[PDB]
Amino acid sequence: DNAIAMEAAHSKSTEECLAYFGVSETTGLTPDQVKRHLEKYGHNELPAEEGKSLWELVIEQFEDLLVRILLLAACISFVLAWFEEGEETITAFVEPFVILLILIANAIVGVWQERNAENAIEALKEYEPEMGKVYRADRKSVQRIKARDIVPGDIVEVAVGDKVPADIRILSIKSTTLRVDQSILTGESVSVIKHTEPVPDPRAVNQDKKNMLFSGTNIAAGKALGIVATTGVSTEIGKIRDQMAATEQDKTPLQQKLDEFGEQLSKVISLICVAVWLINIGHFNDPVHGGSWIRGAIYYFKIAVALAVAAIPAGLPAVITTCLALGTRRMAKKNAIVRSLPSVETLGCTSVICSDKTGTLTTNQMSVCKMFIIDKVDGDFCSLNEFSITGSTYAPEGEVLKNDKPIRSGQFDGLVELATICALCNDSSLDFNETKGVYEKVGEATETALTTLVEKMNVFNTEVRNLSKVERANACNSVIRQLMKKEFTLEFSRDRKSMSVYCSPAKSSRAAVGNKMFVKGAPEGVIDRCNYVRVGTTRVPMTGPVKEKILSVIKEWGTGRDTLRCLALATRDTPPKREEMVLDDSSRFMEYETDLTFVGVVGMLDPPRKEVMGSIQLCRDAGIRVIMITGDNKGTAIAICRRIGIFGENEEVADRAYTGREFDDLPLAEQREACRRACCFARVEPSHKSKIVEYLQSYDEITAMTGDGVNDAPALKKAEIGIAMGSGTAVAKTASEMVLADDNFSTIVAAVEEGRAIYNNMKQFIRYLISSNVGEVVCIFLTAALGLPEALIPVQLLWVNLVTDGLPATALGFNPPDLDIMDRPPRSPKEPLISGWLFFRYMAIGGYVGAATVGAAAWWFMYAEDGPGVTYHQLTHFMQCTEDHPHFEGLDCEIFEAPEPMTMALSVLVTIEMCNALNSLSENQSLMRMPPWVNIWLLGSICLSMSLHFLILYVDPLPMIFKLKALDLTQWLMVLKISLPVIGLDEILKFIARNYLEG
Ligand SMILES: C/C=C(/C)C(=O)O[C@H]1C(C)=C2[C@H]([C@@H]1OC(=O)CCCCCCC)[C@@](C)(OC(C)=O)C[C@H](OC(=O)CCC)[C@@]1(O)[C@H]2OC(=O)[C@@]1(C)O
Ligand code: NA
């Protein structure tokens, strides 16, 4: 290793650290070393975010392909609105202003999101304090400077309440003990004890670096001196920041398809422009003299703008946002806080969920269920006294049972010592809450279950029914505390997996014989140090058959259908002398906890959630793999998976469950192979959550991942759906896409089902709005191919694509979900929205729509009483009316600009899209099977859309702008004559889809 700054500062001794930087602990760094170390390693801060300027942000709103076409069409419309002959400019610059206003309003929204968006990398800067206390050679006393000026090798001073400015190797602990709140890294807020002795492993995890102060953590209690190892992005919190900055998050499948849509849509538009130019090649055979090339050119640029406006679903991005935000409020009531709108689709395509066990799959409400001591040992004969405890709460309510029979715990000398261990070898307590009315825990959940246990046992038969409620919490515990005097506690450490307390009797003023040590820890580790076995009050040497009997029961309790976490309890009858014990060396604690005497074993249960059982079953029906990540041993982790439904009760899982150690010993090839079949990970290393995601993403799995600490932030950001707990850190939240407000696993599944039901409705109105843009383009191409006057103008099309079609599309987001949502495998991300026979249907609808609108306008020019007796051959040559009058003699040439034919065309387009919205209630189901009144919102929206159509037909300022006129009752019949059968057309195509394609 040859990167930068102090490498394995935790494995180096305090002398090797001071000699590395060449800095004295009493004086500190010289002002020359401050300049030198600041120039080499830089300042102690996370790098600033890229100040995306407002101008750069506005330009980003005009980088999409479709908004470029509208901008270009806005320019042509702006030019055409200038170079024109007339005096009516109240309806000239209207069209370009609307296109611009939509573009401006569109750019406004994009900025409104970026101003209100906050990345998780900037949330990490919440854990870096402003000031820091250092000792340098230019002064005597301690001086507080800005934390960004602290350099590696500095002699820093921290105390309780301070926030650790940098990664600090502890030199000297001035106070009695040092407790640090490393809650921002992991999830446990339990303060850990630090020391000054080196940790012999260079590649030890942060949990074992018991001589380090991590940048961002809080000093819980004490005061210490230390030397700065790393600063900036080299800290443990800074190494996480670099992993998050380097993580790239892809666009959602819908976003990738929309970007794909604009690509091909842009190609088709130009191709249509080519085709229109190819149809009117015959103008080359027309004489140069005669005709208006100035008027022939405006016509081609006029239909160009109309072609662009007819193609772009300008209302679609608003309906998606409306549908998403309304669905997000809906998920909020189901405890699913969705932080990113587009994630709702991604949540529906979820195929693999990786959830932590504790707090999510389980309730984190510990409770001691079973316990056993030694009944007697007579050579090879060996018997145990197994008991059972009732009450799943922390409340001291319940009794101890032996063979389903209530027993008095005070009648078993082994259970007396069992309770003494649990009450004294414990740093937690109880507290009866008067606001809530329940018994709450004070400390860890494991040690509190032991506190509840000694209250239920009551080995001394203390009068507890006479005491009050608040005094009932710590009744039997206090009785045991008055007996033995806790001298000191040997803290827990993962190396020996046990803790102990040194106790001396109360009445003992002039004595040195009588001390005891009470050890509590993991069964395998503690039993191996036991050379004796307590039986009631006596003691016998620990043999082989007896020791196997103990482990076998611990195996049955942890692997069986009980799924219990077992803790061995032992006592050191002859503890080492008080003076021969060094309390600063945590490496000699396992030494002090030797030559023990086995007492008994308690078995506690972390019960799974009452809804996890069936939620796992839905994922099986929905084709969603569930993976458990826990800290239980592999045997218990597998047993818990069998309990909640992940594993079958009797299926082979030798290749479907791995520990952190097992996973690392696998090569990268068998690692990626292990992730496609595993559903259980125990004792997971910190870097393994991201590795599991990458391997899952290599099989194109849409992966959800759970976390709550900054340690989980790189994995949350990398996963498609990062899922943070409402009780987690704010960094884990900002790094996640969804927050579980109740930390319940079942909320994940409920949000996936909701995410599926929203997209199925999203498919409809996406396919509905685009189907309208299809038929509109056909109408523009027909009126361009045939040489007809414009049937629809861009002003009208925008009203249709934003208002007239926007209300039904939004109502299509409220379509009732199917009954087999979670009975189908997850949707393929590559699955296109329109293809195959559905492609042909909208191909036929669009051809029909484009003909119906072009025909309705041409119908008024010809076969209408209100209209002229114009024929087909002159309607196509209408631009020659003003010049070649004898060829088209009859009426005014201004009649080819009448509003009546455009209104007929517009009213037809509106009526069809109202009918076509009903056809969008179901993809292939008929309206006879699924009636239109299935969606009341759709019917109401259609009523509103028509009422807004008559609005722009009568309210005098409006029909002048949109160039419309009120239709006669007869002309409205012709609208329905040509609009209504669009239902029969699509209904036939549905029948075909149901009887000759479903196989
Ligand atoms: C809106 C107007 C139409 C003309 C258009 O340009 O859309 C096309 C195109 C972009 C696709 C097509 C359209 O293609 C045509 O309709 C062929 C036009 C030829 C007519 C000339 C004959 C004289 C969609 C619209 O066709 C119809 C038939 O439904 C379907 C689908 O669209 C979707 O699934 C929507 C995805 C947001 C897309 O194939 C899509 O391209 C792919 O990327 C997808 C996946 O988008
Ligand atoms: Na993420």
Return the CATH number at 225: 2.70.150.10
Instruction: Judge contact between 160 and 208, C-beta under 8 A.
Output: no
d(CA 872, CA 889): 14
What tokens were used for 428? 């937690």
Most distant CA pair in the chain, distance: 135
Q: Could you tell me if 612 and 563 lie in one domain?
A: no
Residue nearest to atom 39 of ligand 1 (CA): 834
Render the burial of 617-631: b for 16+ CB within 10 Å, e for the rest: ebbeebebbbbbbbe
d(CA 870, CA 888): 9
Q: Could you tell me if 498 and 510 lie in one domain?
A: yes
- CA distances 842 to 94, 909, 920, Å, are 32, 15, 11
- Exposed, middle or buried: residue 522 (CB in 10 Å: 0-12, 13-18, 19+)? middle
Q: Which residue of 254, 264, 913 sits with most ligand 1 atoms within 8 Å of its CB, as the best mutation to test the pocket? A: 264
> What's the number of domains the chain is made of?
4
Taking the CA of 252 as reference, the closest ligand is: 2
**Residue 199 in contact with ligand 1 by CB distance below 6 A:** no
Can 167 be counted among the known catalytic residues?
Answer: no
d(CA 132, CA 162): 9
Q: Could you tell me if 368 and 384 lie in one domain?
A: yes
The enclosing domain of 735 has a CATH number of 3.40.50.1000
Taking the CA of 697 as reference, the closest ligand is: 2
Could you say which of 167, 356, 712, 805 is catalytic? 356
Q: Counting every residue, how long is the chain? A: 999
Closest CA to 209 of 343, 444, 12, 471: 12
d(CA 683, CA 356): 11
Residues 956/959/963/967 CA torsion (nearest 10 deg): -120
Which of 711, 743, 775 represents a domain boundary (last residue)? 743
Residue nearest to atom 8 of ligand 1 (CA): 265
d(CA 331, CA 329): 5
CA 400 to chain centre: 44
Residue nearest to atom 15 of ligand 1 (CA): 843
Q: Which residue of 828, 834, 843 sits with most ligand 1 atoms within 8 Å of its CB, as the best mutation to test the pocket? A: 834
Q: Relative to the CA of 839, which ligand 1 atom is closest?
A: 28
DSSP-derived pairing of the beta strands 223-230 and 155-159 = antiparallel
Residue 110 Cα to ligand 2 middle (Å): 21
Closest CA to 531 of 596, 576, 600: 596
d(CA 9, CA 320): 53
Half-sphere exposure of 312 (CA within 13 A, CB side): 28
* SS3 (DSSP) at 338: strand
Residues 919/922/924/930 CA torsion (nearest 10 deg): -90
Q: Could you tell me if 657 and 790 lie in one domain?
A: no
Q: Which residue of 251, 269, 274, 839 sits with most ligand 1 atoms within 8 Å of its CB, as the best mutation to test the pocket? A: 839
Q: Relative to the CA of 313, which ligand 1 atom is closest?
A: 1
Residues 520/572/372/485 CA torsion (nearest 10 deg): -70
Which of 180, 215, 249 represents a domain boundary (last residue)? 249
Residue 221 Cα to ligand 2 middle (Å): 35
* SS3 (DSSP) at 129: coil
Residue nearest to atom 1 of ligand 1 (CA): 774
Which of 249, 269, 301 represents a domain boundary (last residue)? 249
Q: Which residue of 64, 255, 265 sits with most ligand 1 atoms within 8 Å of its CB, as the best mutation to test the pocket? A: 265
**Residue 257 in contact with ligand 1 by CB distance below 6 A:** yes
Closest CA to 827 of 174, 304, 349: 349
d(CA 859, CA 972): 13
Contacts of 493 (CB under 8 A, 6+ apart): 210, 499, 586, 589
Residue 736 Cα to ligand 2 middle (Å): 5
Output the CA angle 157-164-139, nearest 5 degrees: 25
Taking the CA of 846 as reference, the closest ligand is: 1
Q: Could you tell me if 106 and 124 lie in one domain?
A: no
Residue 95 Cα to ligand 1 middle (Å): 26
Q: Relative to the CA of 767, which ligand 1 atom is closest?
A: 35
Q: Which residue of 279, 770, 923 sits with most ligand 1 atoms within 8 Å of its CB, as the best mutation to test the pocket? A: 770
The enclosing domain of 929 has a CATH number of 1.20.1110.10
Residue 325 Cα to ligand 2 middle (Å): 19
Q: Relative to the CA of 841, which ligand 1 atom is closest?
A: 28
Residue 127 Cα to ligand 2 middle (Å): 21
d(CA 807, CA 412): 76
Q: Could you tell me if 18 and 112 lie in one domain?
A: no
Q: Could you tell me if 756 and 735 lie in one domain?
A: no
Instruction: Judge contact between 642 and 680, C-beta under 8 A.
Output: no
**Residue 834 in contact with ligand 1 by CB distance below 6 A:** yes
Range of the domain at 918: 52-117+250-351+744-999
Q: Could you tell me if 704 and 737 lie in one domain?
A: yes
Instruction: Judge contact between 626 and 679, C-beta under 8 A.
Output: yes
Render the burial of 172-202: b for 16+ CB within 10 Å, e for the rest: ebeeebbbbbbbbbbbeebbbbbbbbbbeee
DSSP-derived pairing of the beta strands 167-173 and 155-159 = unpaired
Q: Around ion ligand 2, which residues have CB less than 5 A away? A: 717, 722
Residue 705 Cα to ligand 2 middle (Å): 9
Output the CA angle 238-493-689, nearest 5 degrees: 45
d(CA 316, CA 262): 13
**Residue 838 in contact with ligand 1 by CB distance below 6 A:** no
Q: Could you tell me if 717 and 751 lie in one domain?
A: no
Q: Which amino acid does the sequence have at 970?
A: T
**Residue 832 in contact with ligand 1 by CB distance below 6 A:** yes
CA 210 to chain centre: 32
Q: Could you tell me if 835 and 896 lie in one domain?
A: yes
**Residue 268 in contact with ligand 1 by CB distance below 6 A:** yes
Q: Could you tell me if 834 and 965 lie in one domain?
A: yes
Q: How far apart are the first and last CA of the chain?
A: 62
Taking the CA of 340 as reference, the closest ligand is: 2
Taking the CA of 317 as reference, the closest ligand is: 1
| Technique used to solve these coordinates | X-ray
Instruction: Judge contact between 921 and 935, C-beta under 8 A.
Output: yes
Report the run of H or E that residue 556 belongs to, with start and end.
Answer: helix 544-559
Contacts of 392 (CB under 8 A, 6+ apart): 365, 367, 605, 607
Q: Which amino acid does the sequence have at 299?
A: Y
Report the run of H or E that residue 212 belongs to, with start and end.
Answer: strand 212-213
Residue nearest to atom 6 of ligand 1 (CA): 265
The enclosing domain of 505 has a CATH number of 3.40.1110.10
Query: Entry resolution in angstroms?
Result: 3.3
Contacts of 244 (CB under 8 A, 6+ apart): 120, 121, 124, 713, 714, 717, 735
Residue 265 Cα to ligand 1 middle (Å): 7
Question: What are residue 520's phi and psi, to 5 degrees?
Answer: -140, 130
- CA distances 888 to 276, 290, 787, 821, 866, Å, are 25, 16, 15, 63, 19
Instruction: Judge contact between 228 and 23, C-beta under 8 A.
Output: no
Q: Could you tell me if 695 and 748 lie in one domain?
A: no
Report the run of H or E that residue 570 belongs to, with start and end.
Answer: strand 564-572
